[PDB]
Every structure is written in structure tokens, then in C-alpha cells.
Amino acid sequence: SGFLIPNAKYTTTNYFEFYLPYYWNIAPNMDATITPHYMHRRGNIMWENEFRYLSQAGAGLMELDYLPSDKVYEDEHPNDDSSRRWLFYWNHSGVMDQVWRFNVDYTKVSDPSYFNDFDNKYGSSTDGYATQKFSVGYAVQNFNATVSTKQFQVFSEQNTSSYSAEPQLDVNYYQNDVGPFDTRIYGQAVHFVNTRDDMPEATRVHLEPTINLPLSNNWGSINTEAKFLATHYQQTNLDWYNSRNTTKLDESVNRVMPQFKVDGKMVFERDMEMLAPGYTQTLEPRAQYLYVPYRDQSDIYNYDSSLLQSDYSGLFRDRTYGGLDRIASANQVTTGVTSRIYDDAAVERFNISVGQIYYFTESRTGDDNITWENDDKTGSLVWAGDTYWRISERWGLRGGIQYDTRLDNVATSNSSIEYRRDEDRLVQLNYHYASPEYIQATLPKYYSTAEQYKNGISQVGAVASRPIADRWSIVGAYYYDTNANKQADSMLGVQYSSCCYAIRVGYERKLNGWDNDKQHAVYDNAIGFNIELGLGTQEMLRSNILPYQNTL
């Protein structure tokens, strides 16, 4: 337990930065770290406290940052009472006795602009909100019951109204081999409150018995499932919403509705003769009929239901919204095909998937307020495709595309090819796309008119690593937005590694917010060095706002 090596940093938001860490070894399972962090532009010392613990209930980490005063914050906010800033973070995860599951993921900040000014170690400038989750669960082989609390601190000043389930109870019971059938029951009891005192408040009780008949075979499988959904809503505090909205919420709502699903899959095999002998090609057709009757749901406020993306895996999902507030009617057939290549050692070398969703009738909910480019309602509307080619042991290439005829354009698309000789030696290119029509359809209304969200996403990223003489490691990253033709993030890192010490120097320039007065992005630069007592390539590659991900 003693002083560490003080590292230094220069940033455009804080100017010269200084850290003076002190490590306190409390016990074999507990330790703490007290770091005075001098900031010159803000002209004070922020005190940072790490506390790492290991216990019977699991492993946990606590962080407390406190800055008593802030010249910059008081200058920007002269009318506030105090300029103190602070962060509280708590992350606990554990399983005790193999049956008790304890989870805590709590973040609280003093102001929404905390992560735009401070080190992004347990948060980020790319985060739009802070999560505050508690969870205690009991799980055995055929039953589980979880009590959880969920809260969110929204950073955006456009609308901070966020709903939270203060109690939430989840109970799952499983009973296999009930004759030829497999049975399950899912129960939930949730209470939705809101930060604003005029928005509706609710309590919801959900029950879901499901029974399925699976029939397997060497070459095919057929699964039939009958599900029943019973929801009771008791919502109060509706004078405001009923006063200014034409559609009226009801205090008591009962939503009872069946669901029928039939999934089928086939496997065909052939020996690849034209290509190198010994390779086997598998063609995997898959079909799914889904029926869910239409029930009017305009009288239930949407608390936790959002649209779900339709990749190839998501085409066969039986739900089109998350949560339980919105359950769209469905009369659908989903068809997909997956092709796989196998070498002589029976290792999957290549797979490609394509699928579509055909709607026999319009999927309705009674509150269909989604902005669609055209008025397509029935037919083959959603298409998805995936590909993953392992070109060699060092090359890899994944790609994915989503098409929606209602958007009349490709919704989302991603691709990436990586070369990875090893952890110190790799190169990767990636591309991410999201059309403006899809942003208009799925995101809030003001996204379609805001200059920093309306154009969608068109991002090209390049990452590279280069070690020198088994003592130096140079890592670089560059991300470019092609719609605006401008940088989003750049990173450089040089680490000299020796037997007893390692010296790391880093540089990053990132998008760090928006300026509405002139309507343009605000960039941030940071050059820092730290000394420690591997070549650290992976740690350097994780240090930017768009961290590196392995792709093989």
C-alpha cells in the first residue's frame, strides 16, 4: 500500500491534468485507491475513490468522484447555487450458493454534462443516459424469481421524462415431459412511475402459459406452440394526458389473447466436388407461421415497448415490440435459407443467410403511429441477410443487410474484414450504415428534423496495430462519417514495454457534443502518458469512444 506513479494528461476541456494515485491494500479481498486529480482549467482538485471487493455474494466495484467547485461550470451556469460535480458508480455481480444471483449496476452524476467534461472510465461521452439497476434473483433448475428495480437518468435536456419500473417481479416455471409436450409459465408484476408528476402512473400484472410440441429428426424438425397472454393494467394519474390527448386512457384494462406458432426446419447435405474434395455444403430451409389476433391497445400508454430490429435471427422472432405494452397482431409466414460450408475436419468455414417476412394481413396495434415512406401493408415486406466467411486462420469477413419495402430503402447494413495474426498484430476495416428513412421511422420525432441525427449513419472505421522489436506497439484508429465527410474519432498509441516498467503515450480526437448556436459538432483532443510497473496493444485498442472488437 503506497503511492503509484503519477501520470499526466493535457486536454482541451481541462488543459493540464495531474493524477496522484495512492493504493491502500485493506485486506486480501478488499482494496481502495485515492486519487487527487488536479485540473488547471477548472482550477481545483477532484478526488477519485476506487474500492474493489470480493465477497460471498460476488465481486463488486465502487467509485466516488467529488469536485467541490468548478470555475467553468459556474461561468456557464452563473445562477446555480453551487458548482460541485460528482459521480457515484457501483457494479456488483455474484452468484451465492449457485442459487442466489445479486446484480447491481448503478450510475449517478450531478449534471448531464458530466461525461462530456471528465474521464470516460466508468462512463462515456457517447452515453445518452445513466442506468440504475438492482436485481436479486433465486434460480434453480426448473424455476426462477427475480425482483429488480430499474431507473434512468436522462442526460438530454430536450425531454428528461423517463419511466422506471420501481418494483419488478419475474417468475418462470418450466415443466418438461408433460406427455409429448413441454410446458412453461411466465409471470410478471411491475409498477411504472415517472419523474414528471403529471404523466400517467401504472401497475401491470402479466401471465403467460405456453405449451409446445417438438418433433425432431435426423434431417428435419417441426415445433408447434400455443401461448396465452393475460395482462391487467391499473393506471392512474390520467387527468393531464386525457385532458390534452384525443384518445382516452382507461384506469383498468384487461388484455387477453392467444398466440399460435409453427416452426419448421430442414437440413440438406451435399459433397462439394467442384471445389476441393472433402468439403460438405449444407442447405437449411426454415419456415415459421405466426398467428396473433388483433386487440385494440390505444387505451394503454406505452411504458416499455419499442420496435425490435429484424436481422436474420430476428426474422423468426415472435415479437415485434419489446416489453408487454404493445403486442402487434400478426398473420405472418417467415421463410429463410442458411448455407454452410464445412472443410475436411468438419469445421464451419462459411455461412450465408437470407430471409423474408410475408404478411397476409396488416400488423396492427391500435396505436400505429410509425412514419412509413409508403403505404405498404401486406406482402413480402422485411428482408434480412447475414454472411460470415472465415477466409483463413488469420482472415475474417462478416456482413449483414436489412431491407424494408415500407422504408423503400435499405434500413441498416454493416460489414467488416479483419486480419489478426495475434493480439499485437491485427488490421480491421468496418462499415456501418443506417438510412435517414429508418431514423425517421424508428427514432423520436425531433430526430428527423435535428441536423445531427437526420442524415442517418454512414461510418467507415479502420484499426491497425504494429509492434516493433517486441518492445514497441503502435496502434491507430480512424473513423469517418461519409455523409458529413468529416472525422468522428481518431486514436494513436505508443507503448514501450520493458522488464519492470511500461510507458504508454496516447492521443485521441473525438466528437464531444453539439453547438446549437452555430449548429456544428464540438471536438476534443487529449494527449496523456502513464507509467506502469504483454505489449498492451489490446488495452490501447479499447481506449477510444468506438472500441475495437474482435472479428477473426
Binding site: 488469420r394 486480419y419 495474426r421 498484430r425 488490421v427 504494429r466 509492434p467 516493433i468 522489436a469
Partner: peptide, 17 residues
Amino acid sequence: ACSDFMDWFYCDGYPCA
């Protein structure tokens, strides 16, 4: 030539440049 063409970007040895 070489089995791996990415050696030209990182191989060390003798850089011959």
C-alpha cells in the same frame, strides 16, 4: 511469393528499405 502477403507491412527481420 510468401504464403502471407501481409508480412510486407509487418515482418521486421531485415527491413531492406
